[PDB]
């Protein structure tokens, strides 16, 4: 209600007056315009907040609101005489002086629109769903062991080694150079993918890709640091819809280039590098906010956290989030290896991983739309539902584990889509059962600790299973052990249920 709410109600009332006739009842509308103009005079804007008040560079702002309120006077003194046509020309003059005078001290009024175009355009990566067919094609032809037990373990250790140090640098740099560093990380990933020479180059590529998969929370933190808390809900919803639509558009564009357009994979990654340089340009065209999370103290956080240390439902959803998130990332990091294992077709257009990615993103958006609508009491039917979801995950991983048929893996693609139906169905519920108990800073802290423990569990399973000095096991026995792991989780949560 400092500057932006008065600006929004002034814009809404001006849009009402612009399409309204019969000016006897626009007097309430014009005096609400006057109230919104007079209330936004002592507002101290953030681009003026760094400068001292009562300055000669501030007098243009007050003179702009001076001529604004003066033309509101000129409108309403012609509206009180029973006239209906002078108010429209006065509103046009109000529009021109609002565009001229006030907008000098307003940086950018398409911030929601620019974040929507950033979610719809700068998330387009058509080579995302074809990384493993590019690594295992006629170009370089990595073997299955060198892509299973040597590349993605470095991805797991790098995700740990960029979640632990770089999270403070993410919170500290006010999130515009954080997204710039993420764009430069995408540039480094596709330059190491287009100029690969050995396996350690792809290890460095996953080292730079861990920053990209770890800086997804930084986008919503940028939204919370830019958009006010009196506007964060609707703009955050449209931004999440824009991100999901951008991922779906990326997967559909990958299917149109690879399958339909028959574009080669090197040219596919050329297109991906071009759109990621466009994403770097869009990250350069951002706006740096001020109110960061953990840098713009500790005793109040510990006092508010002490009531949420040993809660049973919070610990249940947190341990479920850690275990099922570790299982989710261990399925996603190897499911492309499985898809290139079962159907190793050398033709480029006969690879339908992007269609499975688009259907999985769509079903995840549907199940996220069908997660907050659960008006069911979570007293008794929680742990049995968790056991059923983990049993569904065990069944889908077991279906992915024993499939050795070329025509069935199609449905197994959809099974991975159904795996999102067994994962994204409870992710907004796991967000709602944590965010509704603490403050938003403590909410981000609890989700960071949960992601940290999920990374610990993933790192332990990576260090034990895929290491050649310990077990030394191929991907088939890894998927069998993952099916046994989800079955054991189903047994544990079923014994916890009843």
């Amino acid at each position, epitope marked *: 209600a400092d500057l932006e709410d008065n600006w929004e*109600t002034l814009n809404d009332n001006l849009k009402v007056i612009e399409k309204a006739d019969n000016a006897a009842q626009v*007097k*309430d509308a014009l*005096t*609400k315009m*006057r*109230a*919104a103009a*007079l*209330d936004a*005079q*002592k507002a101290t804007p953030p681009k003026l907040e760094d400068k001292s008040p009562d300055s000669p560079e501030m007098k243009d702002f007050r003179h702009g609101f*001076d001529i604004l*309120v*003066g033309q509101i*006077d000129d409108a*309403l*003194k012609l509206a*009180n*005489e029973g006239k209906v046509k002078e108010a429209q020309a006065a509103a046009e003059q109000l529009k021109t002086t609002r565009n001229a005078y006030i907008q000098k001290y307003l940086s950018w009024r398409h911030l929601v629109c620019y974040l929507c175009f950033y979610g719809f355009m700068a998330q387009i990566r058509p080579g995302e769903s074809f990384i493993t067919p590019y690594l295992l094609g006629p170009d370089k032809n990595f073997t299955r062991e060198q892509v299973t037990n040597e590349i993605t373990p470095v991805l797991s250790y790098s995700y740990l080694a960029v979640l632990v140090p770089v999270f403070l640098l993410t919170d500290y740099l006010r999130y515009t150079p954080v997204l710039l560093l993420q764009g430069l990380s995408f540039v480094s990933v596709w330059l190491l993918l287009l100029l690969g020479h050995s396996v350690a180059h792809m290890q460095l590529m996953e080292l730079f890709y861990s920053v990209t998969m770890a800086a997804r929370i930084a986008y919503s933190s940028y939204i919370f640091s830019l958009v006010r808390p009196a506007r964060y809900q609707r703009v955050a919803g449209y931004s999440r819809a824009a991100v999901l639509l951008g991922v779906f558009t990326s997967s559909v564009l990958g299917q149109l280039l690879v399958t339909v357009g028959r574009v080669s994979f090197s040219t596919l990654n050329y297109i991906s590098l071009a759109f990621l340089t466009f994403s770097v340009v869009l990250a350069l065209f951002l706006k740096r906010p001020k109110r960061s999370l953990f840098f713009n103290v500790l005793a109040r956080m510990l006092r508010e956290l002490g009531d949420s240390l040993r809660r049973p439902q919070l610990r249940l959803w947190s341990l479920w989030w850690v275990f099922n998130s570790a299982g989710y990332y261990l399925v996603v990091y190897y499911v492309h290896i499985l898809w290139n294992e079962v159907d190793p077709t050398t033709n480029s257009a006969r690879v339908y991983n992007g269609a499975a990615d688009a259907a999985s993103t769509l079903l995840g958006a549907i199940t996220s739309f069908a997660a907050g609508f659960v008006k069911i009491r979570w007293a008794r039917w929680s742990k049995l539902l968790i056991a059923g979801v983990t049993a569904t995950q065990a069944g889908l991983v077991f279906l992915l584990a024993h499939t050795r048929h070329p025509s069935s893996i199609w449905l197994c693609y959809a099974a991975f889509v159904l795996f999102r139906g067994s994962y994204q169905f409870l992710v907004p519920i796991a967000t709602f059962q944590i965010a509704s108990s603490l403050s938003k800073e403590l909410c981000a802290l609890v989700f960071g600790v949960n992601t940290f423990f999920a990374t610990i569990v993933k790192t332990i399973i990576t260090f034990i299973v895929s290491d050649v000095r310990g077990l030394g096991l191929p991907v088939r026995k890894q998927f069998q052990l993952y099916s046994v792991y989800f079955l054991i989780l189903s047994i544990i949560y079923f014994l916890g249920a009843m």
Partner: antibody
């Protein structure tokens, strides 16, 4: 000093005509607008009408709309409030008040120099 | 047109008592309200303008505050001269002068 004075109030019949004169000793009406405020005996303050000699903005209150009229002159530096077809509700004290134009010191300062206030009564 | 309600319509205090007269608007009126002190029979006087400022002529024992659409007159040390009727009037436009109801303060007896 600058101040206000009112004249013309007295006894009228219900439905008659009466012309109040508001004079501003000191300032002129081209730099400040004039206002009329009704106060019934026992009741509270309430607004009637205003006039601005810079442009002309004779906009009235809904209880007195189309029944009163006002005309201000800057050569005599005064304002005539002519009232015809009155009712029994207008037995009240009318104050003529100064109030400034936008912006700054004239507008943000409220009705600062109230007048002495004339008194009108309605009785058959 | 709009209303301007003024709740403590009958207050009472002795010499040197802090009183708070509140006043609620109907619309989202900006920080331009007027607190007036009218003696019984005499003319009103501008006491507080723009909801926070002190007028040149009234003493320093008068102030006010804004909380959304709730304006507040505060008197710290109540002088025995200050037993009058205090009126609340939002000034937003020329033709939207809507006074309150008047709060005739009394002596604590």
């Amino acid at each position: 000093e600058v101040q206000l004075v009112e004249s013309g109030g007295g006894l009228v019949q219900p439905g008659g005509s009466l012309r109040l004169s508001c004079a501003a000793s000191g300032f002129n009406v081209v730099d400040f607008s004039l206002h009329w405020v009704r106060q019934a005996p026992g009741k509270g303050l309430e607004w009637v009408a205003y006039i601005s000699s810079s442009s002309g903005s004779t906009s009235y209150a809904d209880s007195v709309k189309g029944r009163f009229t006002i005309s201000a002159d800057t050569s005599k530096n005064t304002a005539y409030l002519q009232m015809n077809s009155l009712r029994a509700e207008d037995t009240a004290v009318y104050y003529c008040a100064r109030w400034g134009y936008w912006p700054g010191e004239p507008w943000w300062k409220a009705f600062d120099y109230w007048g002495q206030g004339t008194l009108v009564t309605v009785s058959s | 047109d709009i209303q301007m309600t003024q709740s403590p319509s009958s207050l009472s205090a002795s010499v040197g008592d802090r009183v708070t007269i509140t006043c609620r608007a109907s619309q989202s009126v900006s920080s331009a309200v007027a607190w007036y002190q009218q003696k019984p029979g005499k003319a009103p006087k501008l006491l507080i303008y723009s909801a926070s400022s002190l007028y040149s002529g009234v003493p320093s024992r008068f102030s006010g505050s804004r909380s959304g659409t709730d304006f507040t007159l505060t008197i710290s040390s109540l002088q025995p001269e200050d037993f009058a009727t205090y009126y609340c009037q939002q000034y937003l436009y020329y033709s939207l002068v809507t006074f309150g109801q008047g709060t005739k303060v009394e002596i604590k007896r």
